[PDB]
């Protein structure tokens, strides 16, 4: 479960706080996916005391809430159950914005991607297996993948040196281009480790 309380002494009406919370959550919380299990208790609350008596322009309210949520998301990612890799999955070149998000979630949730990432293996094949299952417009010929900047997959086939890519560092960036439009999306995830399994099986939580 993810609980989140946001307080502000900025002055805004309920309609204005709703805007800032809905845009922020949609762009951050809705894109934080650690183990694919959505809980029965998730709440984000935005409270205004207005004690500064300054009413900001909407975009300044939006932006500020957005950035607070994002940073919380990063801290959440960094302290996920048994995390050893802070994985960001970006999908670009999709047919629509939604397609990209669906592609990114598909990759981030996949047991094989996550266990490969845990062992520092740049098993890019598993990434392509995963994304091929996403209910989106896809051309297996036009897919490219980079792990931490280094290309591992070029137009559907292996890029020279792929299996040599170093993934021993905690941070891992995955960019997947689908070359079918320009929709794009990013998901924060983590790996599937022994520590995640021990923690979720050794005791009731």
């Amino acid at each position: 479960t993810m609980l989140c309380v946001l307080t502000t002494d900025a002055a805004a009406e309920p309609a204005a706080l709703e805007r800032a919370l809905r845009r922020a959550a949609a762009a951050t919380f809705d894109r934080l996916d650690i183990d694919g299990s959505c809980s029965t208790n998730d709440t984000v609350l935005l409270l205004s005391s207005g004690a500064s008596e300054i009413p900001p322009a909407q975009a300044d309210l939006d932006e500020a809430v957005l950035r607070v949520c994002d940073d919380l998301c990063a801290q959440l990612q960094a302290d996920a159950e048994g995390v050893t890799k802070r994985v960001t999955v970006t999908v670009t070149g999709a047919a629509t914005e939604d397609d990209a998000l669906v592609a990114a979630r598909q990759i981030a949730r996949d047991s094989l991607v996550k266990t490969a990432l845990f062992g520092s293996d740049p098993n890019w094949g598993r990434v392509l297996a995963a994304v091929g299952m996403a209910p989106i417009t896809l051309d297996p010929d036009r897919i490219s993948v980079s792990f931490n900047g280094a290309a591992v997959c070029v137009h559907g086939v292996g890029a020279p040196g792929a299996r040599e890519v170093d993934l021993s560092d905690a941070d891992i960036d995955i960019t997947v281009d689908l070359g079918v439009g320009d929709g794009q999306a990013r998901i924060r995830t983590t790996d599937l480790s022994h520590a995640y399994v021990e923690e979720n099986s050794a005791y009731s939580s």
Binding site: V5, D9, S37, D71, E81, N200
Partner: protein, 193 residues
């Protein structure tokens, strides 16, 4: 210059108190109950919630409360999600909202139940140990302050499988602040509306 700062929480902006107490919900005796308190003048609020069709009582309650756009406070426990607990469970949530409202009226502010938001996290299917929780409410209302260590105790108290709390506050250059605490390490894939 707009500075985004960690180790700073919900008490960073003005017009807010918070604390966190060891009510004894968690066996460990760790911090498990947290309050956030809007001090006015304004009482505006927005919320978004899990789209899962199994929604815990605290959520269904807080969703009703939030149709008014007003909030004086938020009470949050860990050591129990109070989910799948039926009509009685929903009543525990209501009795929490009411004991908070009362404890605030006895502290100095005229607060009723429909102004208190309720949140829970932990195991699904168990009933809250209410005599500990209600006693927690008295103690936490008594201990709330505007200082930073208040955001802290609270951020600490909402943790379940977390190893460290999650806090951030943005001090905007036009002299207002947005602060935040969050929790959650597992069963973590929010689908919010």
């Amino acid at each position: 210059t707009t500075r985004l700062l960690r180790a700073q929480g919900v008490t960073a902006p003005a017009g807010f108190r918070a604390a966190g107490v060891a009510a004894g919900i968690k066996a460990s005796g760790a911090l498990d109950l947290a309050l956030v308190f809007n001090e006015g003048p304004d009482y505006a609020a927005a919320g978004v919630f899990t789209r899962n069709q199994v929604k815990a009582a605290p959520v269904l309650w807080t969703q009703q409360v939030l149709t008014t756009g007003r909030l004086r406070a938020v009470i949050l426990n860990s050591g129990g999600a109070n989910a799948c607990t039926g009509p009685a469970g929903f009543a525990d949530t209501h009795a929490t909202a009411e004991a908070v409202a009362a404890a605030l009226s006895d502290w100095g502010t005229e607060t009723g139940a429909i102004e208190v938001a309720v949140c829970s996290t932990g195991l699904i299917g168990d009933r809250l140990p209410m005599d500990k929780l209600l006693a927690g409410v008295a103690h936490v209302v008594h201990e709330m302050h505007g200082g930073l260590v208040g955001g802290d105790e609270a951020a600490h108290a909402i943790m379940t499988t977390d190893n460290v709390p999650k806090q951030v506050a943005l001090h905007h250059h036009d002299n207002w602040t947005v602060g935040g605490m969050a929790k959650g390490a597992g069963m973590l894939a929010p689908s919010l509306a």
